[PDB]
């Protein structure tokens, strides 16, 4: 790989520079290189990996949605025929998005998850696995759509089981996992009631635990709780 000749510490340093420069494709490439050194990632390094790929895939998802909307409008009655170009370009962006998801899933499978023994690392990686299968599911339309959805579900469910046994209800990883699994239920699995129930139980059980936290931890937890609330407000 192109990062094979660069020191691990230099890749981490450059990932942080890339973040400051808003160069998220570079950041992701540096972090992929760091993962491929074969050592486990620290908490800070896991969050660099996550931030990098979430920005890359986020731009692709936003572009895909724009193009898919244009493509859908073109297929309405009365719309003038414009040729294959919209479909082709949507497919191009889709294929690149799927490639990024496959890259992330590949890092998780080789070998981040299997080496992750602490609850914080294992939940973090399983949540990421669910997220990137969810992004695959957002664009899926073929024979394997059900299996992609079930792969997301299974990863989230394993992460949830560990998080509930091993982390307090205010832990920000646990909260973000529950937030994302609730989005999965609402937007992927056609299960809005499950989404709402999960968001409300998560919020309430975190509320009840805030009293145990320092001011700084309280801020971290309440930020994600507000996102749960925002979704509940959208959905109800």
């Amino acid at each position: 790989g192109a990062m094979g000749s660069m020191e691990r510490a230099s890749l981490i340093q450059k990932a942080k520079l890339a973040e400051q420069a808003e160069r998220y494709e570079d950041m992701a490439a540096f972090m992929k290189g760091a993962v491929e050194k074969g050592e486990e990632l620290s908490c800070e390094e896991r969050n660099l990996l996550s931030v990098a790929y979430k920005n890359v895939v986020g731009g692709q998802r936003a572009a895909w949605r724009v193009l898919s909307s244009i493509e859908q409008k073109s297929n309405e009655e009365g719309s003038e025929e414009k040729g294959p170009e919209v479909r082709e370009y949507r497919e191009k962006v889709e294929t690149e998005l799927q490639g990024v998801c496959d890259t992330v899933l590949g890092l998780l499978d080789s070998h981040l998850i299997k080496e992750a023994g602490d609850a914080e690392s294992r939940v973090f990686y399983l949540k990421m696995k669910g997220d990137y299968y969810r992004y695959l599911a957002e664009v899926a339309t073929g024979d394997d759509k059900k299996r992609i959805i079930d792969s997301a579900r299974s990863a989230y469910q394993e992460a949830m089981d560990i998080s509930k046994k091993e982390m307090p209800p205010t832990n920000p990883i646990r909260l973000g996992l529950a937030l994302n699994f609730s989005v999965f239920h609402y937007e992927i699995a056609n299960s809005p009631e499950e989404a709402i129930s999960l968001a409300k139980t998560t919020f309430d059980e975190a509320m009840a635990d805030l009293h145990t936290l320092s001011e700084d931890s309280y801020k971290d937890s309440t930020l994600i709780m507000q996102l749960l609330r925002d979704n509940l407000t959208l959905w109800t």
Binding site: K16, Q20, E44, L48, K54, L175, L179, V183, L227, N231
Partner: peptide, 9 residues
Amino acid sequence: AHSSXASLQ
């Protein structure tokens, strides 16, 4: 809907 994520940096 809102999904999770901020940078520690």
